[PDB]
UniProtKB/Swiss-Prot annotation, chain A:
Component of the large ribosomal subunit. The ribosome is a large ribonucleoprotein complex responsible for the synthesis of proteins in the cell. The chain holds residues 80 to 319 of 319 of the full protein. There is a cross-link at residues 22, 71, 212 (Glycyl lysine isopeptide (Lys-Gly) (interchain with G-Cter in SUMO2)). It comes from Oryctolagus cuniculus. The modification N6-acetyllysine is found at residues 8, 71, 184. Its main location: cytoplasm. This is Large ribosomal subunit protein eL8. It comes from the Eukaryota. One of its GO terms (cellular component) is cytoplasm. GO terms for molecular function: RNA binding. Keywords: Acetylation, Cytoplasm, Isopeptide bond, Ribonucleoprotein, Ribosomal protein, Ubl conjugation. It is found in: Cytoplasm. Signal peptide: none annotated. Component of the large ribosomal subunit. Interacts with CRY1. Interacts with DICER1, AGO2, TARBP2, MOV10 and EIF6; they form a large RNA-induced silencing complex (RISC). Belongs to the eukaryotic ribosomal protein eL8 family.
Curated annotation (Swiss-Prot), chain B:
The modification Phosphothreonine is found at residue 7. The gene is RPL23A. Component of the large ribosomal subunit. Interacts with LYAR and GNL2. Interacts with MDM2; this interaction may promote MDM2-mediated p53/TP53 polyubiquitination. Directly interacts (via BIB domain) with IPO5, IPO7, KPNB1 and TNPO1; these interactions are involved in RPL23A nuclear import for the assembly of ribosomal subunits. Interacts with IPO8. Belongs to the universal ribosomal protein uL23 family. This is Large ribosomal subunit protein uL23. The chain holds residues 39 to 156 of 156 of the full protein. GO terms for cellular component: cytosolic ribosome; nucleus; ribosomal subunit. Component of the large ribosomal subunit. The ribosome is a large ribonucleoprotein complex responsible for the synthesis of proteins in the cell. Binds a specific region on the 26S rRNA. May promote p53/TP53 degradation possibly through the stimulation of MDM2-mediated TP53 polyubiquitination. The modification Phosphoserine is found at residue 5. N-terminus is methylated by METTL11A/NTM1. Citrullinated by PADI4. Its main location: cytoplasm.
Amino acid sequence: VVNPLFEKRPKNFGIGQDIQPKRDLTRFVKWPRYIRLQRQRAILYKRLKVPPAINQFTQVLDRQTATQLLKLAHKYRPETKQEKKQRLLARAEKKAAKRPPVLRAGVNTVTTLVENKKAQLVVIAHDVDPIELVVFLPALCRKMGVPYCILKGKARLCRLVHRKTCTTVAFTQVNSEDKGALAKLVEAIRTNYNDRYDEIRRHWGGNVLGPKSVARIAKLEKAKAKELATKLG
Amino acid sequence: KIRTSPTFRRPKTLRLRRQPKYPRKSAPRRNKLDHYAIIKFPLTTESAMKKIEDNNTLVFIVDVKANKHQIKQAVKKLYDIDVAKVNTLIRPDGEKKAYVRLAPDYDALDVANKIGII
RNA sequence: GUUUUUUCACUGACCCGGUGAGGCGGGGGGGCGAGCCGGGCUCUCGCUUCUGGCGCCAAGCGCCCGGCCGGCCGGGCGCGAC
RNA sequence: GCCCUCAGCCGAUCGAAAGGGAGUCGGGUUCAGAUCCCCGAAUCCGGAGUGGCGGAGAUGGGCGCCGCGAGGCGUCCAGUGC
């Protein structure tokens, strides 16, 4: 069947022998300036001693609660922009021939009505850009009694409301069809956000290196383990 | 899809075609080197009349911006006559003077009468 | 605790050299060797000096995918850099 | 038009009428011009869409079936020159 002509012919890429192959080089590339910045404005947030109030934004709601909390808010969305052409138009049909429960978008509508004493549950988004818009807010939901919670995705908060981003989206009204499932999520949030809030206050981020010295220091700790081992026994 | 060369060069990016909304000047600027502007007056000195009967050529005066290529069709498309070659120069008074050789089947004293230079 | 200060240490500002920013740090996998009775512990290595030659744009091996009537003809995803 | 690969540059642009840099030479002619005019000999780069004609690649070897022989018939492998 086979042909005796054909010959397998290897290469020997060992040093000084056969021109090296083409290969995986990501890790050595000279990147542009606009990337070389952004990749090391996340390394100065593990080394550097992030203080405790900005440090509570890494604390975020998990997977089974984040896909469950956007199904109750799915029934209490604002109407579409095309719905306002059959509602405003629907007045001139019945005349010429009590709002249903919905959200509160924006920080300047949320911060007033959490202290006004109306709302039930307040939500926050994590990646808030110039950070000083929402540094004051979680300590203000601590005192009053309006339990806060953080979801990873300021993008996908302001996809409830039709826009590009948001920051905070609060509830003040819910129907009598959903009065158990809103009274349920407030208990799974409050006991680990405004009972352990105190716990939160102490917990400084930072002083945690890049491995390139974990595994030289650790290297020499074992250096003061074999001197204490063979000495004794 | 994977890396291979240690540089970063800028990707290619689509470019449309122009498609203007109003055409900037209202009509195309007109051409003022006709046949008429290009040929001025025939030159008729002792030494031009020595270059008609003898050689079988003519002597012209010509808009200084004029090509040779341009001139050669303007002598072609007004006296009707086909050309061999059109030498030029530029005088110390500052105008263009083209020496116009002619064809053997054509004749030089004979066409010269038609126009007026004798 | 809060500081008053002496040393030896760290890297994240910030400085300098090098290059087409081409293989640096951690573990695993095999060869040569050190010692305890097929078993692990502590490592030394990872293939190129005889000549004033030659070396690139993968052979070899798996696993699928469409064309003509078991054979004829043309592409995809891997091994080599674990 | 779009996609797949394939491409080291290396710095825009200016700087030499005595550096570098393909190819024109004879006989005649005008008061004043000629390696530029006219008679005659030559030839450098571009161009060819129907690439306009010759030549070169290319013309061969071995068997069968008729023929006194030169050749004629099919049937099967060579020919990028010597």
